[PDB]
Amino acid sequence: SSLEGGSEFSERIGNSLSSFLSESASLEVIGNELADNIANEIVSSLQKDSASFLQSGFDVKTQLKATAKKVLVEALKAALEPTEKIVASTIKPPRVSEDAYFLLGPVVKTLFNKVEDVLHKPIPDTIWEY
Amino acid sequence: SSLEGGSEFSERIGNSLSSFLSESASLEVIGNELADNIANEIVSSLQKDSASFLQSGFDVKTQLKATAKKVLVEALKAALEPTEKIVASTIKPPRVSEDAYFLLGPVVKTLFNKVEDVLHKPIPDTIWEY
Ligand code: NA
Ligand code: NA
């Protein structure tokens, strides 16, 4: 189970991310071409490792790509609320002065509300209610 | 191209993360069951989406999981340095009060160094500079 062009796959990841600084590249564009890299590499490497998969259905291979990419997306969205729960658990009083949370909480709620909108997974603002 | 038990896949993710606070669970453990979640869900969802792949049989499907998991790990390692370079670029003065970076910088270098150690990818702390 070795990857097809693993050394070259690692470079493509760096470039996708490096293009945020080297070019003005939307966070959302990079997310998409990272999933393309990962999904593509999974199909490349499976063709290499399975004679039987190579034998099959270029239809199957485009579907594997589409599925793997969809999974990555849905995985990241699934991680957002538990993450907020973790963050909110760390900054909620007594861990922070409740007067201090009056200021801090809305800052983080706002920060994560940006992520909620970029990832199109809106989450209740009640997590931060206290 | 729908996922197999999408609502239930979202839950396995949360539990993997929620176990960071409860159980005081190892970071290496949580990251691993995350790649197993994703790798497993890719195989599950392709059984659902493609008729022939459901027909392909066990030899191929376990290889897919192995490959998918491997691709995820290598993707993370290739992304860590370019990611640090992005984070550092974003929070380095003037972007932040340089007195504020004095407090903030060492927190995130340590934060990222936790990840460096788990994945056996050390990166110079020089990236956080002045
Ligand atoms: Na929200
Ligand atoms: Na380091």
Residue numbers in the entry:
A (entry chain B), B (entry chain A): 46 to 175
What text appears in the publication on this structure?
Cell-traversal protein for ookinetes and sporozoites (CelTOS) is unique among traversal proteins as it is essential for traversal of malaria parasites in both the mosquito vector and human host and is therefore critical for malaria transmission and disease pathogenesis. Even though CelTOS is critical during cell traversal by malaria parasites and is a leading transmission- and infection-blocking malaria vaccine candidate, its function remains unknown as it has no sequence similarity to proteins of known function. We show that CelTOS specifically binds phosphatidic acid, a lipid predominantly found in the inner leaflet of plasma membranes, and potently disrupts defined liposomes composed of phosphatidic acid. Additionally, microinjection of CelTOS into Xenopus oocytes results in membrane damage. Together, these results demonstrate CelTOS is the only known apicomplexan protein with universal inner leaflet cellular activity as it addresses phosphatidic acid found specifically on the cytoplasmic face of plasma membranes, and disrupts these membranes to enable the exit of apicomplexan parasites through diverse vector and host cells.
The mechanism by which CelTOS enables the traversal of apicomplexan parasites through cells within the mammalian host and arthropod vector has been elusive because CelTOS has no sequence similarity to proteins of known function. Therefore, we determined the crystal structure of CelTOS from the human pathogen P. vivax (PvCelTOS) in order to obtain insight into function. CelTOS forms an alpha helical dimer that resembles a tuning fork. The dimer has a large buried surface area of 3003 Å2. Consistent with the structure and large buried surface area, we established that CelTOS is an obligate dimer in solution by sedimentation equilibrium analytical ultracentrifugation. Two N-terminal helices (α-helices 1 and 2) of one monomer pack against the C-terminal helices (α-helices 3 and 4) of a second monomer to form the dimer. The outer surface of the CelTOS dimer is mildly hydrophilic and masks inner hydrophobic surfaces created between the two tines of the CelTOS dimer and the dimer interface. Strikingly, CelTOS resembles class I viral membrane fusion glycoproteins and a bacterial pore-forming toxin with roles in membrane binding and disruption. The C-terminal helices of CelTOS show structural similarity to HIV-1 gp41 and Mycobacterium bovis ESAT-6, and the N-terminal helices show similarity to Hendravirus fusion core; Nipahvirus fusion subunit core. The dimeric nature of CelTOS may serve as a chaperone-like function to retain CelTOS in an inactive state prior to membrane binding as the dimer masks the inner hydrophobic faces of CelTOS.
